[PDB]
Amino acid sequence: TPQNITDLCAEYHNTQIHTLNDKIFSYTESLAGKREMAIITFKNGATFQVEVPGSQHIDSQKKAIERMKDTLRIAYLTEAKVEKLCVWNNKTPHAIAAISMAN
């Protein structure tokens, strides 16, 4: 079991770590049919999604997707410093797999 986000990320294909060390600049959330997703940006212009749930996610990932939207919504509002994001880079925008917050 990985002890940090970087080791976690390395277990998967098509991922990379972005190091932001910055708060989230924008949080966007949608309930539109087939676009039930969130999108975050940072001030350097970097953009990331939490994906619409589908068959690329296993059942166990379904609740974790919901938790990530809770977390990103409140991280945004709380201005918490995002250390790193682990994301799938086979998607546009890049899709979040993991986040770490620290100061």
Which residue ranges make up the site for its own copies (CB under 8 A)?
Answer: 1-5, 8-9, 11-12, 15, 25-37, 39, 41, 47, 49-53, 57-58, 60-61, 63-71, 73-78, 80, 83, 86, 91-93, 96-103
Binding piece for other proteins, criterion CB under 8 A, among 3-11, 41-49, 69-77, 89-97: 69-77
> Tokens representing 84?
């790193």
State yes or no: residue 7 binds other proteins (CB under 8 A).
no
Q: With b meaning 16 or more CB within 10 Å and e meaning fewer, what string describes 60-85?
A: eeeeebeebbebbeebbeeebebbbb
In angstroms, what is the minimal distance from the CB of 16 to other proteins? Answer: 27
Among 26, 67, 89, 90, binds other proteins (CB under 8 A): 67
| CA nearest neighbour of 56 among 47, 68, 65 | 65
DSSP state of 14: T
